[PDB]
């Protein structure tokens, strides 16, 4: 619906961020909690303040931007694009690096917890790992279809990837495949680690979030969305799970799988969700 919405944990809408000229595909909070970054099919990243207003527009990608992330220190923004690149930007919106190496669209991006490695997911079926000088360090091969999302474990030693092959895969930094999470019945659209590292959450077009242990065994299936689930996130305290869906909602769930809230207000599909660092604000992209 071309907006980002900001909500509290009780379901109350706080702000609507208007200005993108096409779909918003992803959202992230800065580590100080004051700035929100959004990615859009209009080929831009926008930076917004939590009071609801646009600060900056980062132009430069030549196709849709599919995801955005902040470094742990807040000083670098990473964006993924169908132009086959990841771009790294400073907080002035100046372009620092373009990471080239993927041979098709880049669908997601994440920073390692130490801020020194970037992971990218691509339709070329790979995850690539990079440093902040744009140098390619490793390619993770094994998915049999497009990779849709990527995340680092809190200790930084395990990478999780989501794929249209219906799996999540877990890897080390040397590119070794460690575990495959098999169980979704359609494409997996996103993956996240709990802050203690002991639960993995995955989102799927099968309309569920699944929760798994670190051996890749299914622990719970969260049912309730009425269309594809497009993203998932854990709150910083680990006590709340957020899911985004083509049913136009975000749902909030406790760790026991109980539905806590549905965030209703977007007028089209929700494509991503994020928690503020204090865990009290949720951002949704649509």
Residue numbers in the entry: 0 to 285
Quoted from the paper:
β-Propeller proteins are common natural disc-like pseudo-symmetric proteins that contain multiple repeats (‘blades’) each consisting of a 4-stranded anti-parallel β-sheet. In the larger propellers a so-called “Velcro closure” is found, in which the N- and C-terminal β-strands are part of the same β-sheet, keeping the propeller closed. This “Velcro” can occur in different positions; in the “Velcro 1-3” variant, the closing β-sheet consists of one N-terminal and three C-terminal strands, while for the “Velcro 3-1” variant, the opposite is true. Starting from a highly repetitive β-propeller sequence, we designed a consensus motif sequence that formed a perfectly symmetric 7-bladed β-propeller.
We decided to position the termini so that a glycine residue would be removed, theorizing this residues contribute little to the overall interaction energy and stability of the fold. Hence the central aspartate was removed instead. While the space group and packing differ between the crystals, the structure is identical for each protein. In both Pizza and WRAP-T, the “Velcro 2-2” conformation is the least stabilising, which presumably explains why it is rarely observed in nature.
